[PDB]
Amino acid sequence: GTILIDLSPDDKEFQSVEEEMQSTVREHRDGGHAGGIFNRYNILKIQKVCNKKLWERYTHRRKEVSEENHNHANERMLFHGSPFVNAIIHKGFDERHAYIGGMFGAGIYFAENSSKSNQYVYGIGGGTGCPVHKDRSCYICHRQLLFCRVTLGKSFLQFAHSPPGHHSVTGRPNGLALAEYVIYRGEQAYPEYLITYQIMRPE
Ligand SMILES: O=C(c1ccc(Nc2nc3ccccc3n3nnnc23)cc1)N1CCOCC1
Ligand SMILES: [Zn+2]
């Protein structure tokens, strides 16, 4: 029972979500190899994801975590990129989405940099790029990211099961790079906004 509601570009919600997406683009150490070369996006659509089952599942787990962490869920809004967006918005996050080869163990990874999430849209390392042109830097084909509500709780600061007494891991990666986060329970993230976009070729 997932439905998707389109937001008007005149909606404050559309504008705040776009701004978060645009303002967290950075340059990457791969020179654009995985996610492409761009400074900004063309946002084409932003849809609100509404699923009562997945939400109650999220808030139930949020309450648990909160009570184990001095009444502090440590809830963030973070980006996630994946080939399986469609599965996520209907079935939610689960152990099948655990990135076994990730630097912080077999969990689900999120990012403050939208452009880091962009690198995983066509798979790990950008895969073979867009299905139509096999171009990881394609300026034509439409991409999709998720902007997710994420419960971090007590997060282990790093410079499958979570670390003992901790509900998530914070990776603190470079001075301009923002944090990346890992959760080990699928119930600790809710896929709230689905964003459709293109990367833009710099002028
Ligand atoms: O295709 C994927 C996969 C991998 C990574 C992300 N998403 C992200 N990975 C990140 C890794 C490191 C740092 C940040 C990452 N990130 N930010 N946003 N999304 C990701 C999705 C699917 N998998 C294969 C099937 O089983 C599950 C794993
Ligand atoms: Zn393409």
Domain CATH number, residue 36:
3.90.228.10
- Chain CA centroid to CA 19, Å: 15
117 C-beta closer than 6 A to ligand 1: yes
Angle (CA) 36 49 67, round 5°? 100
Return the residue whose CA atom lies nearest to atom 10 of ligand 1.
109
**Cα of 18 from ligand 1 centre, angstroms:** 22
Q: How far is CA 7 from the centre of its chain?
A: 19
For the chain, what is the radius of gyration of the CA atoms? Answer: 16
Task: Give me 19's structure tokens.
Answer: 């701004």
Q: Which residues contact 183 (CB under 8 A, 6 or more apart)?
A: 93, 107, 108, 110, 150, 151, 152, 162, 167, 168, 189
Residue 81, domain extent:
1-203
CA–CA gap between residue 168 and residue 150 (Å, rounded): 10
Q: For 126, what's the count of Cα atoms within 13 Å in the CB-facing half-sphere? A: 21
Domains in the chain, number: 1
Give the chain as a 3 state SS string. CCEEEECCCCCHHHHHHHHHHHHCCCCCCCCCCCCCCCCCEEEEEEEEEECHHHHHHHHHHHHHHHHCCCCCCCEEEEEECCCCHHHHHHHCCCHHHCECCCCCCCEEEEECCHHHHHCCCCCHHHCCCCCCCCCCCCCCCCEEEEEEEEECCCEEEECCCCCCCCCEEEECCCCCCCCEEEECCHHHEEEEEEEEEEECCCC
| Identity of the residue numbered 120 | Y
What was the experiment behind these coordinates?
Answer: X-ray
Find the 163 Cα to ligand 2 centroid distance in Å: 40
142 alpha carbon – ligand 2 mean position (Å): 8
Spatial contact of 4 and 167, defined as CB atoms under 8 Å apart: no
